[PDB]
Design a protein around this ligand. Structure first.
Ligand SMILES: *C(=O)[C@@H](N)[C@@H]1N[C@@H](C(=O)O)C(C)(C)S1
Length: 265
């Protein structure tokens, strides 16, 4: 039984685990704590890039964005290396997804614009996709630090899975913008020990991870069977019991994904 397996993993990792896989042709939705709130962490960058793409002509990707020393306030493996030169919107989208670059995402929020440095427009974008649950209230680094239980900067496995489904498999974006988002997630560098670790090599996996305080570790993916049948997989976790400095545990997400893959095979 899946729910028993997910509950075992919670005990093993002293964690709270949430899982959602939306229903398909012949598979029932998989759900475990799927309607409980968990912090977005960096997972918001997938819908953020979709918002920026949707909002502008495709050649907005070529616009140069400049920023300064004081814009670097979070883990930013790419943007730290380009303060002098600036970075194009395309480069920022690439870094935000593939390296989970925090400065890149902050700049993309500012590009999207409006109150809260773009957090309100980001949240409005989710509303336009029928997501009445998720909310973004702060940018990096603040968005990863909300106390366990606090609703700021949260989504649910259920809400984010339905959003990702529309973005990658549905018609939220035109085909050209959709392919840009899909390709970036396909080329993600941060995801190898999460959902990817739970599916066999002949399944395609694209994803966006998030990590935060209180042992937060998330991964949202779209996967395709060896015959091209797609499934959306959202896994979210925290370890409130270890306090603010609780270590995130990727292995928990790998094991949860392995369990899901077992059902979907
Ligand atoms: C977003 O959660 C932010 N903490 C960046 N994302 C994490 C992840 O993607 O797993 C990093 C790469 C640990 S930093």
């Amino acid at each position: 039984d899946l729910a028993d397996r997910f509950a075992e993993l919670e005990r093993r990792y002293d964690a709270r685990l949430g899982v959602y896989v939306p229903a398909t042709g012949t598979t029932a939705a998989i759900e475990y704590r799927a309607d409980e709130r968990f912090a977005f962490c960096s997972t918001f960058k997938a819908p953020l890039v979709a918002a920026v793409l949707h909002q502008n002509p495709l050649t907005h990707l070529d616009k140069l964005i400049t920023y300064t020393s004081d814009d670097i306030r979070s883990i930013s493996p790419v943007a730290q290396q380009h303060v002098q030169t600036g970075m194009t919107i395309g480069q920022l989208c690439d870094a935000a997804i593939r390296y989970s670059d925090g400065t890149a995402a902050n700049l993309l929020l500012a590009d999207l614009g409006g109150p809260g440095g773009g957090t309100a427009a980001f949240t409005g974008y989710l509303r336009s996709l029928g997501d009445t649950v998720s909310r973004l209230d702060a940018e990096a680094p603040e968005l990863n630090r909300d106390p366990p239980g606090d609703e700021r900067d949260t989504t649910t496995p259920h809400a984010i899975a339905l959003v990702l489904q529309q973005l990658v498999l549905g018609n939220a974006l035109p085909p050209d913008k959709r392919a840009l988002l899909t390709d970036w997630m396909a080329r993600n560098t941060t995801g190898a020990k999460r959902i990817r670790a739970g599916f066999p090599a002949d399944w395609k996996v694209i994803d966006k991870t998030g990590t935060g305080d209180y042992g937060r570790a998330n991964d949202i993916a779209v996967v395709w069977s060896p015959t091209g049948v797609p499934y959306v997989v959202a896994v979210m976790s925290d370890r409130a019991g270890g306090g603010y400095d609780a270590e995130p545990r990727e292995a928990l997400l790998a094991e949860a994904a392995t369990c899901v893959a077992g059902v979907l095979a």
